[PDB]
Amino acid sequence: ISPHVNKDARDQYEIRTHLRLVDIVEPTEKTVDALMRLDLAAGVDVQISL
Amino acid sequence: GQKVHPNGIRLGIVKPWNSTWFANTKEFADNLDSDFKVRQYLTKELAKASVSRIVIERPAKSIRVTIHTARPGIVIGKKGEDVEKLRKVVADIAGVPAQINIAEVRKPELDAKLVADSITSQLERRVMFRRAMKRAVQNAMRLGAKGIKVEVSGRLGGAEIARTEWYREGRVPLHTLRADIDYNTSEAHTTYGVIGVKVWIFKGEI
Amino acid sequence: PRRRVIGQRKILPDPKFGSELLAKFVNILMVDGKKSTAESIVYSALETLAQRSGKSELEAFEVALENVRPTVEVKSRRVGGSTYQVPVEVRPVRRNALAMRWIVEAARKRGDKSMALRLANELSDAAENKGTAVKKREDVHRMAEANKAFA
Amino acid sequence: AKQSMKAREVKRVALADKYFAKRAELKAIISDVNASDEDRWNAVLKLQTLPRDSSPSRQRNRCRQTGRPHGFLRKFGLSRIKVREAAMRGEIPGLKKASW
RNA sequence: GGCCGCAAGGUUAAAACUCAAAUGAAUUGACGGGGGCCCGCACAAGCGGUGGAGCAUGUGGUUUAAUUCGAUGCAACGCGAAGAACCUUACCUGGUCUUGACAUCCACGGAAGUUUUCAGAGAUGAGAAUGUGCCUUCGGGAACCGUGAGACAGGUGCUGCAUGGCUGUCGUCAGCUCGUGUUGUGAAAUGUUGGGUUAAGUCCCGCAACGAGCGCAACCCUUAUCCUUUGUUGCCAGCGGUCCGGCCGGGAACUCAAAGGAGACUGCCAGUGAUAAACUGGAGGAAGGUGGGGAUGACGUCAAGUCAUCAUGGCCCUUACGACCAGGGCUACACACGUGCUACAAUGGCGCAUACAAAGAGAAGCGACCUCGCGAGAGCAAGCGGACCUCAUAAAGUGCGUCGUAGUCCGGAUUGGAGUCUGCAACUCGACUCCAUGAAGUCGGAAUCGCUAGUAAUCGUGGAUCAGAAUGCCACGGUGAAUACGU
């Protein structure tokens, strides 16, 4: 945290990543359409696997 | 002793972030550089419109910017033109489709960035710093704040030896994490060097 | 310390003979965080000593300790820019601790083959009332006797 | 840092991008175990004939905002000082002071 | 000079010259080899080290063409540097350019890819291919390239005693101040002092004082005990299969995962105490008196550190203190110091066989199985942006042999010979592998350091910087002690 020389002065930071899982087994034709049509907030990342 | 940043110590408890998006390790650096350039351009261009906060969000494949200001007429323009120009240039810089939104500051007397900018402008115009500070403290306390503090440092009045001065009023409890404290800073360029200004404002516990 | 209170820490009995004294002895012999080595050394030495003396291990150990326990020591004081050696009593726990430490220190400085043999020989010599530990006890008693005028 | 020291890196990156394909395999058959007796002698010669600034190991990671060649973090593309400033101002999503 | 006295001396009593002060009483601090009361690994009671040997590494000095610059009582010396072969670079020798390596304005000509000669390279002299978008609404040069005149660009050059921003230390010590009232001619005082008490200017009770603000405590993270909700890539009590492997059907109980909750408050019992604040014991409970650990740094002090991360007033150079290139140096060596690793052995060295973890990283990446090599490695080649695959075997320990106090079957510097990998290139100056050689050292003078519990001591594992280069830095678990009478 100092610009020049002091070595025992320090800061410690962390980032946390949260994770969730959902699975659907017997769908219909319209459910996949709705799910691919949906929209989400800015800071959420979503992945769909068939 | 050295103190800790009031806003940084409070992020996540009573304070939000100024940027919101999710990225993997391949895109963090590029996104940060893009945001730096965007904010730089906007601050250069709207230097006369009383800007105090720029919020950037990234949906799937777009960019959304929100500007907090106290002079919406100048930003919006007549029949919505200057915002169109700014959208064009922001899209050019970012590299993807862009959207711009505007938001109001009711009272620029309770905003920590705008007070600092005003004091810096008066100092550049050669007003006396004691008057400059007292006016700010008095207006802030009249319009309903629970406490304020102002600090000014560096070769005041042209003296050969530098100094630091401050004023306070009300309550400013910097050790309590549930307290809404707003903080910002600014610099002034004179014929003798740089002068620094800091402002703390208190609005109650949450 | 100045304004503190020291509480006792619970000790656990030794596996085969439930001897808190022997747990303390193993602790004092212990080195470097390894406890099994010390336990093996202690048990081997005690077994050989029992074979040599024809009595129980506890009895042999207790006789050895009785022949080495002290009763009066000397403590330093500063008066008039000089040093006085005031004689003072000793508590039972300190007696036990001093005895065990002196025995171990004496044993570690011999010239036999293994530590087990060293310890067996040292304990036998102590039981017969001759050796370095008893020499140290005698020296302490003599230095305490030489200073009875400063009580 | 200096403006010239900043320009040098642009030059190096451009040349690496230009000659990547040529340097990749048409010249790195020296590791081939059944290429030929000395059809790789010419490979080594005409590899060393190329410009020196085209080897990726002659690039140094510098801070994007200042140019500092020491104290670099790959996740952010910045140096420690600027990382701290941006973190305190609140412009790095998800980052905060940690304790445990 | 006069008078007095045996003498020592007494009494009356000047001038020239030099300075802008000398002095009394009282006020706020600081100090005392002055007094009173308290605290802290400050002493005392204990356990391991450093100072001697070999080897990392930083500094002083010396040497050199250069050994580039900064920090330098505690609070510099494994410090800026979370990683100097070229590059990084900031230093030296030599070869070269002058509107410029990096920007905005004017004009005049045109458009990016392949290839051969001289150069150490920089950089000069060569060929054919190419015809673009656009308003072609006629030239727009918009895209990029080359050349000429400046207006200007450029500086890791000086001043940290001209500055902003950031940091060390007294010190997580309990203090530092203001409004109105009152006392003194005034500088100032009271409050904040006193009797108890606390880790604490923490709290109660008194008193010309009545009230506030910054600090203390709480609001934040993690750890330990339980309940509810969803069971995959995680789990396997009861049932049935089996190849004896959660491998199969299955189950939602338990371990585990991360979301909402409950719990600890001197809340209860007895004694002491001023009808007071509090103090010493006990019950129940996973946990008891701020349960354990972390983040959090008051008004101020040291003209403390940083113009070299960045920014910035003043000064200074601009055919040069500003670009470009090859080769050297920061790695020198009579000598002095600070922080570390490895020993000087039997609580051990060598051989064979076998228990038991936590936390992390992976796309120009981590790389299994199989074959070849004594070995570092090589060739083919699955899976994995991951509770799924890879890194990836924990070590000390435990059982059976062998060595028998020797400078040794202890210790491992230094040197010769063969190789491997990353990299345009390992001479000066990289890390590893095999064969051979086999040094000092036998517990270290006057000095001197760390530690009060899952701590010290000991054994292994991971990560950032990184093409390649840790014994240093930051993190993780296993085994696991001694002592505190007292000031």
UniProtKB/Swiss-Prot annotation, chain A:
Q: Which family does it belong to?
A: Belongs to the universal ribosomal protein uS10 family.
Q: What is this protein called?
A: Small ribosomal subunit protein uS10
Would you say which domain of life the source belongs to? Bacteria
| Complex and partners | Part of the 30S ribosomal subunit. Can also form a heterodimer with the transcription antitermination protein NusB. Binding of S10 to NusB is mutually exclusive with its incorporation into the ribosome. The rRNA transcription and antitermination complex (rrnTAC) consists of RNAP, NusA, NusB, NusE (this protein), NusG, SubB, ribosomal protein S4, DNA and precursor rRNA; S4 is more flexible than other subunits.
The free-text function statement in the UniProt record for this protein reads: Involved in the binding of tRNA to the ribosomes. Part of the processive rRNA transcription and antitermination complex (rrnTAC). The complex forms an RNA-chaperone ring around the RNA exit tunnel of RNA polymerase (RNAP). It supports rapid transcription and antitermination of rRNA operons, cotranscriptional rRNA folding, and annealing of distal rRNA regions to allow correct ribosome biogenesis. In complex with NusB is involved in the regulation of ribosomal RNA (rRNA) biosynthesis by transcriptional antitermination.
> Where is the organism placed in the taxonomic lineage, from the top?
Bacteria, Pseudomonadati, Pseudomonadota, Gammaproteobacteria, Enterobacterales
Shown residues in whole-protein numbering: 53 to 102 of 103
From Swiss-Prot, chain B:
Entry keywords, A to Z: Ribonucleoprotein, Ribosomal protein, RNA-binding, rRNA-binding
Taxonomy, superkingdom: Bacteria
Q: Which GO terms describe its cellular component?
A: cytoplasm; cytosol; cytosolic small ribosomal subunit
Q: What Gene3D superfamilies does this protein map onto?
A: 3.30.300.20, Ribosomal protein S3, C-terminal domain
Q: Which GO terms describe its molecular function?
A: mRNA binding; rRNA binding; structural constituent of ribosome
Q: What Gene Ontology terms for biological process does this UniProt record contain?
A: cytoplasmic translation; ribosomal small subunit assembly
Q: What InterPro entries does UniProt report for this protein, alphabetically?
A: KH_dom, KH_dom-like_a/b, KH_dom_type_2, KH_sf_prok-type, Ribosomal_S3_C_sf, Ribosomal_uS3_bac-typ, Ribosomal_uS3_C, Ribosomal_uS3_CS
Query: Boundaries of each KH type-2 domain copy?
Result: 38-106
Q: What role does this protein play?
A: Binds the lower part of the 30S subunit head. Binds mRNA in the 70S ribosome, positioning it for translation. Plays a role in mRNA unwinding by the ribosome, possibly by forming part of a processivity clamp.
Describe its assembly.
Part of the 30S ribosomal subunit. Forms a tight complex with proteins uS10 and uS14. With proteins uS4 and uS5 encircles the mRNA as it enters the ribosome, which may play a role in mRNA helicase processivity. Some nascent polypeptide chains are able to cross-link to this protein in situ. In collided ribosomes contacts ribosome rescue factor SmrB.
What is the similarity comment for this entry? Belongs to the universal ribosomal protein uS3 family.
Q: Which PANTHER family does the UniProt entry name for this protein? A: 30S/40S RIBOSOMAL PROTEIN S3, SMALL RIBOSOMAL SUBUNIT PROTEIN US3C
Write down the NCBIfam families for this protein, in alphabetical order. Answer: rpsC_bact (TIGR01009)
Listed name of the protein = Small ribosomal subunit protein uS3
**Native species of this protein?**
Escherichia coli (strain K12)
Gene that produces this protein:
rpsC
UniProtKB/Swiss-Prot annotation, chain C:
Q: Does the keyword Ribonucleoprotein apply?
A: yes
At the top level of its lineage, which domain of life is listed? Bacteria
GO:BP terms for this protein?
Answer: cytoplasmic translation; negative regulation of translation; ribosomal small subunit assembly; translation
Transmembrane helix is among the record's keywords: no
MF-aspect GO terms = mRNA binding; rRNA binding; structural constituent of ribosome; tRNA binding
The portions of this protein that span the membrane are none
Q: Which family does it belong to?
A: Belongs to the universal ribosomal protein uS7 family.
Subunit info here reads: Part of the 30S ribosomal subunit. Contacts proteins S9 and S11. Cross-links to IF3 and the P and E site tRNAs.
Other remarks on this protein: The strain K12 sequence is shown.
- What is the designated name of this protein? Small ribosomal subunit protein uS7
Q: Which organism is it from?
A: Escherichia coli (strain K12)
* Lineage start: Bacteria, Pseudomonadati, Pseudomonadota, Gammaproteobacteria, Enterobacterales
What part of the full protein is here?
2 to 152 of 179
Curated annotation (Swiss-Prot), chain D:
Q: Name one GO cellular component term.
A: cytoplasm
Keyword annotations from UniProtKB, A to Z: Ribonucleoprotein, Ribosomal protein
| Pfam families, per the entry | Ribosomal_S14
Top-level taxon of origin: Bacteria
Instruction: Enumerate the GO terms in the molecular function aspect.
Output: rRNA binding; structural constituent of ribosome; tRNA binding
Bilayer-crossing residues are: none
Describe the subunit structure: Part of the 30S ribosomal subunit. Contacts proteins S3 and S10.
Q: What is known about what this protein does?
A: Binds 16S rRNA, required for the assembly of 30S particles and may also be responsible for determining the conformation of the 16S rRNA at the A site.
Concerning its family, UniProt says: Belongs to the universal ribosomal protein uS14 family.
Q: What is this protein called?
A: Small ribosomal subunit protein uS14
